[PDB]
Write an enzyme that holds these catalytic residues in place. Sequence first.
Site, short mmCIF file in Angstrom:
data_model
loop_
_atom_site.label_atom_id
_atom_site.label_comp_id
_atom_site.label_asym_id
_atom_site.label_seq_id
_atom_site.Cartn_x
_atom_site.Cartn_y
_atom_site.Cartn_z
N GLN B 172 0.82 -1.21 0.00
CA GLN B 172 0.00 0.00 0.00
C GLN B 172 0.86 1.27 0.00
O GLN B 172 0.62 2.18 -0.78
CB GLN B 172 -0.97 0.00 1.19
CG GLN B 172 -2.11 1.01 1.05
CD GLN B 172 -2.88 1.23 2.35
OE1 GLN B 172 -2.54 0.68 3.40
NE2 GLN B 172 -3.93 2.05 2.27
N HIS B 176 1.39 3.69 -3.55
CA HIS B 176 0.68 4.96 -3.42
C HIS B 176 1.55 6.19 -3.68
O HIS B 176 1.12 7.32 -3.45
CB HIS B 176 -0.03 5.04 -2.06
CG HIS B 176 -1.33 4.30 -2.01
ND1 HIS B 176 -1.46 2.99 -2.42
CD2 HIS B 176 -2.56 4.69 -1.59
CE1 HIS B 176 -2.71 2.60 -2.26
NE2 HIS B 176 -3.40 3.61 -1.76
N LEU B 353 -5.29 -3.62 -11.27
CA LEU B 353 -4.88 -4.94 -10.78
C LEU B 353 -4.30 -4.91 -9.36
O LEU B 353 -4.37 -5.90 -8.64
CB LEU B 353 -3.91 -5.62 -11.75
CG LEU B 353 -2.48 -5.11 -11.97
CD1 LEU B 353 -1.51 -5.63 -10.90
CD2 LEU B 353 -2.00 -5.52 -13.34
N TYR B 354 -3.75 -3.76 -8.97
CA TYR B 354 -3.06 -3.63 -7.68
C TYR B 354 -4.00 -3.31 -6.52
O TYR B 354 -3.55 -3.02 -5.41
CB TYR B 354 -1.97 -2.56 -7.78
CG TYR B 354 -0.60 -3.01 -7.32
CD1 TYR B 354 0.48 -3.01 -8.20
CD2 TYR B 354 -0.37 -3.45 -6.01
CE1 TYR B 354 1.74 -3.42 -7.79
CE2 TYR B 354 0.89 -3.86 -5.59
CZ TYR B 354 1.94 -3.85 -6.49
OH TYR B 354 3.19 -4.25 -6.10
N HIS B 357 -7.21 -5.39 -1.82
CA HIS B 357 -7.94 -5.23 -0.56
C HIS B 357 -8.29 -6.54 0.17
O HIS B 357 -8.48 -6.51 1.39
CB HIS B 357 -9.18 -4.35 -0.76
CG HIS B 357 -8.84 -2.95 -1.18
ND1 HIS B 357 -8.93 -2.52 -2.49
CD2 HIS B 357 -8.38 -1.89 -0.47
CE1 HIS B 357 -8.56 -1.26 -2.56
NE2 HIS B 357 -8.22 -0.85 -1.35
N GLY B 495 0.90 -8.15 -14.10
CA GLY B 495 1.62 -7.46 -13.03
C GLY B 495 3.12 -7.37 -13.20
O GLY B 495 3.71 -6.31 -13.00
N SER B 499 5.37 -4.02 -13.36
CA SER B 499 6.20 -3.84 -12.16
C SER B 499 7.69 -3.66 -12.49
O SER B 499 8.31 -2.69 -12.05
CB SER B 499 6.01 -5.01 -11.19
OG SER B 499 6.92 -4.94 -10.10
C1 HEM Z 1 -5.26 -0.29 5.18
C2 HEM Z 1 -6.54 -0.38 4.83
C3 HEM Z 1 -7.02 0.19 3.48
C4 HEM Z 1 -8.01 1.07 3.32
C5 HEM Z 1 -8.87 1.69 4.44
C6 HEM Z 1 -8.14 1.34 1.90
C7 HEM Z 1 -9.05 2.19 1.31
C8 HEM Z 1 -9.02 2.66 0.01
C9 HEM Z 1 -9.86 3.70 -0.55
C10 HEM Z 1 -10.96 4.47 0.21
C11 HEM Z 1 -9.50 3.86 -1.83
C12 HEM Z 1 -10.12 4.85 -2.84
C13 HEM Z 1 -9.44 6.21 -2.75
C14 HEM Z 1 -10.42 7.30 -3.11
O1 HEM Z 1 -11.07 7.21 -4.18
O2 HEM Z 1 -10.56 8.27 -2.31
C15 HEM Z 1 -8.43 2.92 -2.12
C16 HEM Z 1 -7.77 2.77 -3.32
C17 HEM Z 1 -6.70 1.94 -3.59
N1 HEM Z 1 -6.26 0.87 -2.82
FE1 HEM Z 1 -6.72 0.73 -0.78
N2 HEM Z 1 -7.19 0.59 1.23
C18 HEM Z 1 -6.48 -0.14 2.17
C19 HEM Z 1 -5.44 -1.01 1.90
C20 HEM Z 1 -4.88 -1.28 0.67
C21 HEM Z 1 -3.83 -2.25 0.39
C22 HEM Z 1 -3.15 -3.15 1.43
C23 HEM Z 1 -3.57 -2.21 -0.92
C24 HEM Z 1 -2.52 -3.07 -1.67
C25 HEM Z 1 -1.55 -2.49 -2.39
C26 HEM Z 1 -4.44 -1.22 -1.53
C27 HEM Z 1 -4.50 -0.86 -2.86
C28 HEM Z 1 -5.16 0.23 -3.38
C29 HEM Z 1 -4.81 0.91 -4.61
C30 HEM Z 1 -3.66 0.58 -5.58
C31 HEM Z 1 -5.84 2.04 -4.75
C32 HEM Z 1 -5.93 3.09 -5.88
C33 HEM Z 1 -5.27 4.38 -5.40
C34 HEM Z 1 -5.46 5.49 -6.41
O3 HEM Z 1 -5.87 5.19 -7.56
O4 HEM Z 1 -5.19 6.66 -6.06
N3 HEM Z 1 -5.23 -0.68 -0.53
N4 HEM Z 1 -8.16 2.21 -0.97
C1 LIG Z 2 2.42 -6.38 -9.50
S1 LIG Z 2 1.90 -8.04 -9.14
C2 LIG Z 2 3.20 -9.13 -9.58
C3 LIG Z 2 2.96 -10.50 -9.56
C4 LIG Z 2 3.97 -11.39 -9.91
C5 LIG Z 2 5.22 -10.90 -10.28
C6 LIG Z 2 6.23 -11.79 -10.63
C7 LIG Z 2 7.48 -11.31 -11.00
C8 LIG Z 2 8.55 -12.33 -11.39
C9 LIG Z 2 9.97 -11.87 -11.03
C10 LIG Z 2 8.41 -12.58 -12.91
O1 LIG Z 2 8.86 -11.70 -13.68
O2 LIG Z 2 7.81 -13.61 -13.26
C11 LIG Z 2 7.73 -9.93 -11.03
C12 LIG Z 2 6.72 -9.04 -10.67
C13 LIG Z 2 5.46 -9.52 -10.30
C14 LIG Z 2 4.45 -8.63 -9.96
#
Ligand code: HEM
Ligand SMILES: CSc1ccc2cc([C@H](C)C(=O)O)ccc2c1
Lengths: 551, 552
Positions: B172, B176, B353-354, B357, B495, B499
Site C-alpha cells: 500500500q 501509493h 490490478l493492484y 484489498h 503485473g 512492475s
Molecule cells: C489499510 C486499509 C485500506 C483502506 C482503508 C483502503 C481504502 C481505500 C480507498 C478508500 C480507496 C479509494 C481512494 C479514493 O477514491 O478516495 C483505495 C484505493 C486503492 N487501494 Fe486501498 N485501502 C487499504 C489497503 C490497501 C492495500 C493493502 C492495498 C494493496 C496495495 C491497496 C491498494 C489500493 C490501490 C492501488 C488504490 C488506488 C489508489 C489510487 O488510484 O489513487 N489498498 N483504498
Molecule cells: C504487480 S503483481 C506481480 C505479480 C507477480 C510478479 C512476478 C514477478 C517475477 C519476477 C516474474 O517476472 O515472473 C515480477 C513481478 C510480479 C508482480
Amino acid sequence: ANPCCSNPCQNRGECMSTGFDQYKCDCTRTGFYGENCTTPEFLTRIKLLLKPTPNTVHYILTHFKGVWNIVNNIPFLRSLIMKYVLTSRSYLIDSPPTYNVHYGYKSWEAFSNLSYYTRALPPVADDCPTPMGVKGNKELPDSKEVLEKVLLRREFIPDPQGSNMMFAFFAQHFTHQFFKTDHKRGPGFTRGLGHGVDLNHIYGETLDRQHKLRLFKDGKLKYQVIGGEVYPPTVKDTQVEMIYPPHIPENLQFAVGQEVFGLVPGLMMYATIWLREHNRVCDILKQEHPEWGDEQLFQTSRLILIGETIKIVIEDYVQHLSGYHFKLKFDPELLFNQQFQYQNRIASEFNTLYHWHPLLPDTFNIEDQEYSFKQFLYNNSILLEHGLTQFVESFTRQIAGRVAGGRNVPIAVQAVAKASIDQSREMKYQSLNEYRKRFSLKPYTSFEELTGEKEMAAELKALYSDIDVMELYPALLVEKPRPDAIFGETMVELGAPFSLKGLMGNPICSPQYWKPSTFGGEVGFKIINTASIQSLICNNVKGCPFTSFNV
Amino acid sequence: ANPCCSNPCQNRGECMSTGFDQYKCDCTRTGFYGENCTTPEFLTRIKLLLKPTPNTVHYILTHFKGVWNIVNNIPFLRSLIMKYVLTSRSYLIDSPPTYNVHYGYKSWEAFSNLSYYTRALPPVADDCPTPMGVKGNKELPDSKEVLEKVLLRREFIPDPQGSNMMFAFFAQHFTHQFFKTDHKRGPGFTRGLGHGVDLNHIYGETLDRQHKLRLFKDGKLKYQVIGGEVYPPTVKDTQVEMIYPPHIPENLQFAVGQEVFGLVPGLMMYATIWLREHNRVCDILKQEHPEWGDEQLFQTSRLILIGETIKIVIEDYVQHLSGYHFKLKFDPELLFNQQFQYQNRIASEFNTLYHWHPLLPDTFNIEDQEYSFKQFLYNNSILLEHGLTQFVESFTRQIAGRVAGGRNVPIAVQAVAKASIDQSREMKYQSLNEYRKRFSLKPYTSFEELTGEKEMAAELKALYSDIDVMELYPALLVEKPRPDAIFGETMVELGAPFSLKGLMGNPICSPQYWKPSTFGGEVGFKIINTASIQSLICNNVKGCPFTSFNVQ
Ligand code: HEM
Ligand SMILES: CSc1ccc2cc([C@H](C)C(=O)O)ccc2c1
Ligand code: HEM
Ligand SMILES: *[C@@H]1O[C@H](CO)[C@@H](O[C@@H]2O[C@H](CO)[C@@H](O[C@@H]3O[C@H](CO)[C@@H](O)[C@H](O)[C@H]3NC(C)=O)[C@H](O)[C@H]2NC(C)=O)[C@H](O)[C@H]1NC(C)=O
Ligand SMILES: *[C@@H]1O[C@H](CO)[C@@H](O[C@@H]2O[C@H](CO)[C@@H](O[C@@H]3O[C@H](CO)[C@@H](O)[C@H](O)[C@H]3NC(C)=O)[C@H](O)[C@H]2NC(C)=O)[C@H](O)[C@H]1NC(C)=O
Ligand SMILES: CCCCCCCCO[C@@H]1O[C@H](CO)[C@@H](O)[C@H](O)[C@H]1O
Ligand SMILES: CCCCCCCCO[C@@H]1O[C@H](CO)[C@@H](O)[C@H](O)[C@H]1O
Ligand SMILES: CCCCCCCCO[C@@H]1O[C@H](CO)[C@@H](O)[C@H](O)[C@H]1O
Ligand SMILES: CSc1ccc2cc([C@H](C)C(=O)O)ccc2c1
Ligand SMILES: *[C@@H]1O[C@H](CO)[C@@H](O)[C@H](O)[C@H]1NC(C)=O
Ligand SMILES: *[C@@H]1O[C@H](CO)[C@@H](O)[C@H](O)[C@H]1NC(C)=O
Ligand SMILES: *[C@H]1O[C@H](CO)[C@@H](O)[C@H](O)[C@H]1NC(C)=O
Ligand SMILES: *[C@H]1O[C@H](CO)[C@@H](O)[C@H](O)[C@H]1NC(C)=O
C-alpha cells in the site's frame, strides 16, 4: 573552497569532493583509470590510435564526389553509414539527462524539473576563485570589448557554403520551438516542456492555446484569407496572447503557436507555410477517412507534420549544413536493432551555440526593395505587400552571412550577442577547451590555432591572456572555418550530437509509433517519407516556386 | 458503428477504420500477417512451438529447489536468467507510451500529457453498441450483484504463501507514490507526474511541499520527538496539507510526503520508518562529506533511498510474492548491453490490478489488542501507544488474506471494490480475455476454467452469459490461484511486466547514473546494494526486531 574547481577529472570522469581540500574521480565506463581518469585501458589505446580526427572525417565526406555518388546509390551501404552517424553522435549525449544551471551533481530535482535546460557540462561552482575554475583572472574580460573587437561586423562576409535566407529563417523558425528561454526565471530555464520537435510553435505549448488556434472542423487550424491568400488568424479572433508592439493594428496581429513569431516576417512566412501544410494534410486525411471526426483528423495531421519536419531537417537542412557528398537519410528503422533512448532534454549549450545571428544580412532584400532592421522587424505588412511567392523567390536568392571566421555579427543585433556572452557567464559555463574535451576534441594550444589568423588572435590574447580561459560562445563565431564552409570544428562537433539526438529521440521514431496506422495509413506515411523543403513550398505556395537552402 | 469495435486485429496488430464499415489491421513487426494479423511467419511458428506456457514456467520456478540453490550460487547463470526475466517482461510494455482513457489511437496529446494514466489496451470506442464492443448485452451485470456474489468475504481466507501485514502495508505504502488518482479530473488521471519510483510519498510531489517538510540543516527532513521516539512533524508546525477528519487533534495530524497517509497507522508506520531512514543516511553522508551543504546532502540521500526502495522491492517484496526459488537480483548492469528504454508511464490497468484489498484482515492485531476498521482508520494515537517496535513485531505475525480465489474482500471496504468495477467500466476497459491475449495468454473458454471451481463460475455465467464479456478486475480476484499461491495466472502475467518496467526504467538504473559518484561515493553506493527490509527496520526501529514479508 571546492577542490573540483580545476576540473581535474578527464575523459567524461566525474569529480566528487572527499573533504575540504580532497577529491576523487569516478572513472566508471570511461575506458580510462587512475587519479584523474587519464591512464588508458588496453581496448581504449587501440581505439585512440585507429580513431580519425573530425577534420580528417570531414575531409573524406567533402571530397571524392564520384565515390560517394556510387555509395549513395547502394541502399545497404547508405543505410550502414547513416546508422553509424546516428549512433556515434548520440552516445555523446547523456540520456536520461544529468546536470543543469543549479546542479553540478546529479539529483532528482535536476532530472525531474522540466523547466530547466539540461547541461552537457556541469556549471562552475559558486565558490570557485575564478569564473572558469582556477585559471585566469578574478574577472573575465569586458563583454562589450569582446563584442566589438572580434565579433561585430565591419563589412558583410557572405557564406562560402552558399546558405540563403530560406535557410536562416528555417533555422530560426525550427529551433524556436525548443529554444524558449523563460526570462522571468532565468537564462537556464525553458518554456518548452516538450524538449524537442513537438511543433508547439505551430500548435501552442498548452491545450488552451491549441484549442484557441483550432477551427474544430475537419481537424483544421483557424485561418483568414487576405487578397485570395491563406494567412494565420488574428489575435482578436482567437484570443491567444502574442508579443506585439502597441502600434501594430488589430488586423496585422497574427496568431500562431509561438508568441514571438510576429517579430520577423521571415518567421511569419514559415508559420503561414506550415499552417497551410496542416490544413492540406487534413484535406488528404478527410478524403481517406470520411468516418473520422475533427479530433482524430487534427492529431493525425500533427503527427504527420512532425514526421515531415524531421525528414526535411535531416535530408535538406542538415544535408546542406554538413556540406557532405554523402546522402543523409531519415529512417527510424536504422535504430531498431541498436541501443537508443527515445527521449530528449534540450541542453543550454545547444541553445548557446545556435545563436546564428551572423547569418543575418545588412538589409533584407525582397523583390525590388531593401529593408533595414527597423523597417523589417514587427512589420508583417511586408508579407502582405509582396506575398509568399515573392518571399520564397527573393529569400532563395539572397545570400546569408558566414557564422564562423569572426567579425560578422550585425550591429543592429549587438545587444543579443552581448547577452549571449553575459548570460553564459551568469550560468557559469566552463571554458571552450573543457567543452572541446567533452566532445572528443583536442584543446587549442593558442588563439592563433583557434582563429587560423593573426589579428583577431592577438586581440583575444590581450583580453583573455590564456587559451584555457577562452569562452565557448565567442570562440564559435571567431573559430577558423573549414575550407569554404560556414562553421568551424567546434560548432559541428557540439551541434551534431545535440541535433541528431533531438531529432531521432522523438516518439514517432520509436518502433511502436513508426508504422502506417499511426499516420492514418499508407497515405500519411508517404507524406512523411517523400517530404522535402521544395515539396513543402510547392504544395503550399502559389505558383510552386523553386527553392533550396543554398544560392 | 465503428468497425474496430469487435477488436478484430490479433497479436498486437492495430485497428484502423478505412470507411464507415471497413477496417484495416496494421501487422507491422507483429510476426504475423493477413486481414486480422493471424497468419504467422516461419520464425514466428517456430517460436510458438518452443515457447512454454506461463503455468509451466511458474512450475519450474516453484519446484526443483535443490537445482535453484545451485543456480543461485553460480553468478553468471543467476545474471543470465535475471537478464532474461527483465528483457522478456519489459518487451510487453509500450515505451514510449501510447494510449490513454481519451485516445484509442496514437496522438501527441496522449504522449505528452503526463496527467493521464497510460493504457496497455485502448479504450472501447464511445460509439460501440456494447460496453465490451460487440459481444454481450447492452448493459454489463449489476456491479452490486458481482460484488456480493463472488467478491465479498464470508469468512477470512488466509494467504497460503504466508504474506503478513508488513507485506500488505508495504504494498500500500510503496504503490501509493505512483497510484494517485486525480478524482477532480476522473479515474483515468493521476497526480503522480513522476510516473514511477520518485519517493514523492516521502518528499512531496511539489517543490513547495518538499521545502515545508525539510529542516534545511544537514540535508534532513523535519521531525519531532514524542517519548524519546522520532515521528513526523505536525500539520500545525509545517503547514503541509494532509487529509484528516475534522475531529482529529492538532498533535495527532502527522505531515508526510503523501497527503492520504494518515488514513491508516500501517501507512504512517512506513512513513515514519522511511523518514528515519532519510535522516540516518544524512548523518552517514555528513561523516563522509563534511564539506557538503544542506542541499547536496538532501538530494544525495533521496537518490540513495530511491536505490534502496528498488532493491527492497525486487529482492524482498517481489521475491516473496513470486514464490520462486530463484534468487532475484537488483543489478542495472544487466541491461547495459540490452535494448531498454529508461523511462516509464504508469498504466491504468496496473493501478486496477493492484487493488489488493483482500489482503486486509477483519481485525488489526497489535500486541494484545484487536482493532476494528472503525477503530483503526485515521487513528495515529495507536501508533504512539504501541510504538514502531510493537507495530513491526505484531504485523510480522499477522497473516494477510488471499487475493485470488474469490470471496475474500472485507465488507468494511466493499464500496472501494464496487468503485473499482464501476470506474473500470467508466474508463471503457476491454474484456479480461482481450487483456489476456494482449499479454500472450490463452483466452478462457468457460467460467469454470477461470475459477477452477463450479459454484462461483455458475454465478458469473448467470450474470455475464459469455466468457469473452468477463471484466478484468473481478476476474483477478476470483481467478483460480496457482498451487498454494496468492495470485492466479492473469495477475502475475500482467503485473510482472508493469512492475519490472517501472523499477528498471528509473533513471538511476541508466549507465550515466549507476555509479558510486551519484550516491556520494562507495559508502552511499553500498547502502543501496546491501539494502533489505530487515536492514531498513533494524537501523530505524528500536531493538532491531525481526521482520519479514512472510509469517514465521
Ligand atoms: C489499510 C486499509 C485500506 C483502506 C482503508 C483502503 C481504502 C481505500 C480507498 C478508500 C480507496 C479509494 C481512494 C479514493 O477514491 O478516495 C483505495 C484505493 C486503492 N487501494 Fe486501498 N485501502 C487499504 C489497503 C490497501 C492495500 C493493502 C492495498 C494493496 C496495495 C491497496 C491498494 C489500493 C490501490 C492501488 C488504490 C488506488 C489508489 C489510487 O488510484 O489513487 N489498498 N483504498
Ligand atoms: C504487480 S503483481 C506481480 C505479480 C507477480 C510478479 C512476478 C514477478 C517475477 C519476477 C516474474 O517476472 O515472473 C515480477 C513481478 C510480479 C508482480
Ligand atoms: C531575424 C532577425 C533576428 C532578430 C531580430 C533576433 C533577435 C533575437 C533576440 C531579441 C533574442 C533574445 C535574446 C535574449 O535572450 O536577450 C534572440 C535569441 C535567440 N536567437 Fe535570434 N534574432 C534573429 C534571427 C535569428 C536567427 C536567424 C537565428 C538562427 C537560428 C537566431 C537564433 C537565436 C536563438 C537560438 C535565440 C535564443 C532563443 C531563446 O532561448 O529563447 N536568431 N534573438
Ligand atoms: C523547477 O525549479 C525551479 C527553480 O527552483 C522552480 O521555480 C521556483 O519555485 C520556487 C518554489 O515555488 C519559487 O520560490 C519562491 O520564493 C519563496 C521560496 O524561496 C516562496 O516563499 C515563494 O512562495 C516562491 N514563489 C514566488 C515566485 O515568489 C521560485 O521563485 C521559483 N523560481 C525560481 C527560478 O527559483 C520550479 O517551481 C520547479 N518546477 C517544479 C514543477 O517543481
Ligand atoms: C491534459 O489533459 C487534460 C484533459 O483534457 C487537461 O485538463 C483540462 O484542461 C481544460 C483546459 O485546457 C479544462 O477545460 C476547460 O476549458 C475551457 C475552454 O473553454 C475553459 O474555459 C475552462 O476554464 C476549463 N476548465 C474549467 C475550469 O472548466 C479542463 O477542466 C481540464 N480537465 C479535464 C479533466 O478535462 C489538461 O490541461 C492537459 N494537460 C496539459 C498540460 O495540457
Ligand atoms: C567517411 C565515413 C565516416 C562516417 C562519418 C561519421 C560521422 C562523424 O562521426 C564522429 O567522428 C568524430 C571524429 O572521429 C568523433 O569524435 C565522433 O565521436 C563521431 O560521432
Ligand atoms: C523457460 C524460461 C524460464 C525462465 C524464467 C522466465 C520468467 C518468465 O518469463 C515469461 O514467460 C512467459 C511464458 O513463457 C512469457 O509469456 C513472457 O513473455 C516471459 O516474460
Ligand atoms: C458476513 C456475511 C457475508 C455475506 C455477505 C454477502 C451477501 C450479500 O449481502 C450483502 O452484504 C452487504 C455487506 O454486509 C450488505 O451491505 C448488504 O445489505 C447485503 O445485501
Ligand atoms: C546544430 S549545428 C550542426 C552542424 C553540423 C552538423 C552535422 C551533422 C552531420 C550529419 C554529422 O553527424 O556529422 C549533423 C548535424 C549538424 C548540426
Ligand atoms: C512597414 O512596411 C511598409 C511596406 O513595406 C513600409 O513602407 C514601412 O516603412 C514599414 N514600417 C516601418 C515601421 O518601417
Ligand atoms: C483510537 O485508538 C485508541 C488507542 O490508542 C483508542 O483508545 C480509541 O478508541 C481510538 N479512537 C477511535 C475513534 O476509535
Ligand atoms: C591529476 O593529475 C595528476 C595525477 O596523475 C596530478 O599531478 C594532478 O595534480 C591532478 N589534478 C590536476 C588538476 O591535473
Ligand atoms: C478476420 O478474419 C477473417 C479474415 O481471415 C475474416 O473472415 C473475419 O471476418 C475477421 N474476424 C473478425 C474478428 O471480424
